[PDB]
Amino acid sequence: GPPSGKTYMGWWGHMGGPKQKGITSYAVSPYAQKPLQGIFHNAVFNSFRRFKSQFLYVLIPAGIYWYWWKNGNEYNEFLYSKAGREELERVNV
């Protein structure tokens, strides 16, 4: 097999990270854990966590764009109604 280029990721046994020392990890077999009831205990309780932390970053631009749309949509509606033909002749041509 030919020599290919070096990258920032290797494989099992030589992944490419720094040497690890002092960290101990523990785990328990899924077979020994409470038959999954965390769907309506720590998922619905902890629900809206990802919401109230991030929603503003989405809601403000969402609101800005929705308002701009509704505003322009209503202006169009008026421009094409009887009451708006005067301003329509102006702003158009």
Binding site: G22, Y26, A27, P30
Partner: protein, 431 residues
């Protein structure tokens, strides 16, 4: 292996050996590390060390006596060795050390020095004995929050918090007559050792029964102590095994013998009749491994330990080993069972009939403390010869096939995959 046991309050058990040349007398208690708490853990290892204290050893050396102490999970021993005739003086030292030196050995100078010794002793073990340190963590994760999880030597944290008071409280609760057996092995006769015991009297620390608590429980889990600075990956993996007195005690041991032990550096070891060897030698998946069937009072551990420098093929080492284990449930052959019978006998032989009296003392005591009398090889060999392929399959079908596992490892274990990937290999797909 031939026993003889009598009682008069103090239970005495011996095993004569006309070709001994020496004799060992001592006491063994039915309490070990599994009888300690997570906070007084190491108190037994501490007792062992003050008994073997420099002062105490000089007092025995002048008498032509050699001291020995072994701390295990279920039992604890203190043995004295001498020539066949000086046996009368060994009992005097035992009586002196455990029925008079309740404050002699516990002096501020002797204690603080011993404590300091076992502290460095344990710090070294935890620092350099990777295969045993891993095996100890195997017990620690497998029986977590349960008696069997505590390390026999104890932890550095609880070790340095121990005071003479801790040593005494343990002694008051475990160094009792109802929880002991006076042992005599070597060439001395039974109806002679009991006399010297009857020669004295008293009953200091008697009548009381030892304490009780919760039973050992196996939990499928793992503890990973990754250390990339080490040159190897040391791992130990096992299922819940058999307790002493289990109907499958010998079947489980025969199963372990089937996969055996291996040292990739010894020519003869590479030639053993273990199918697993055909899979791991092509790419040299490890430097060594050894299967085991550890048995204690409440539970056991059946599995193996391995050491390897092939850090990129650990998944294959594990995969191939567990795939061979599956065979015990579905395809183990007659010849494999017959080869295991022969070798189990051989190992039981080298264990129970070594020329060493202190080994026989520990085995005699620890065994009578559970079943009431050490088992003869003749009977063991008969149970072993009766094991059929079906016995092995039925056993593997319950302790191995698709059962939870306990894992522990240190060193370069990045290549050791997740729990589930390992747990999956405990069975095979079928129609």
């Amino acid at each position: 292996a031939e026993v003889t046991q009598l009682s008069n309050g103090i239970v005495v058990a011996t095993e004569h050996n006309p070709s001994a040349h020496t004799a060992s007398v001592g006491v063994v208690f039915g309490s070990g590390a599994a009888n300690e708490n997570p906070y007084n853990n190491g108190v037994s290892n501490l007792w062992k060390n003050i008994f073997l204290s420099k002062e105490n050893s000089a007092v025995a050396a002048k008498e032509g006596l050699a001291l020995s102490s072994n701390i295990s999970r279920d039992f604890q021993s203190y043995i004295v060795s001498s020539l066949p005739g000086s046996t009368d003086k060994s009992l005097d030292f035992l009586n002196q050390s455990f029925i008079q030196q309740k404050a002699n050995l516990l002096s501020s100078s002797n204690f603080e020095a011993t404590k300091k010794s076992v502290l460095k002793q344990v710090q070294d073990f935890e620092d350099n004995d990777h295969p045993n340190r891993v095996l100890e963590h195997l017990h620690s994760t497998a029986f977590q929050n349960t008696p069997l999880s505590l390390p026999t030597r104890g932890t550095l944290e609880s070790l340095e918090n121990l005071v003479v008071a801790d040593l005494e409280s343990f002694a008051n609760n475990h160094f009792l007559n109802s929880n002991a057996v006076v042992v005599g092995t070597g060439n001395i006769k039974h109806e002679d050792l009991v006399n010297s015991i009857e020669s004295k009297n008293l009953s200091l620390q008697t009548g009381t029964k030892p304490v009780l608590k919760k039973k050992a429980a196996f939990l499928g889990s793992e503890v990973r102590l990754r250390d990339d600075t080490l040159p190897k990956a040391w791992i130990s993996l096992a299922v819940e095994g058999e307790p002493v007195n289990s109907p499958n005690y010998f079947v489980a041991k025969l199963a372990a013998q089937i996969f055996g032990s291996y040292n990739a550096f010894e020519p003869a070891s590479r030639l053993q009749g273990i199918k697993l060897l055909d899979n791991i030698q092509e790419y040299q998946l490890c430097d060594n491994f050894n299967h085991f069937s550890l048995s204690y009072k409440d539970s056991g551990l059946w599995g193996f330990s391995t050491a390897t420098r092939n850090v990129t093929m650990i998944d294959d080492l594990i995969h191939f080993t567990l795939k061979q284990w599956n065979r015990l449930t579905i395809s183990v052959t007659d010849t494999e069972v017959e080869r295991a019978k022969s070798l189990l006998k051989l190992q039981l032989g080298q264990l129970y009939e070594s020329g060493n009296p202190v080994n026989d003392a520990n085995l005699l005591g620890a065994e009578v403390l559970i079943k009431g009398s050490k088992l003869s090889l003749g009977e063991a060999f008969k149970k072993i010869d009766a094991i059929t392929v079906k016995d092995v399959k039925a056993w593997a079908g319950k302790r191995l096939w698709d059962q939870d596992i306990a894992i522990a490892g240190t060193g370069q274990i990045e290549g050791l995959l997740d729990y589930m990937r390992i747990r999956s290999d405990m069975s095979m797909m079928r129609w």
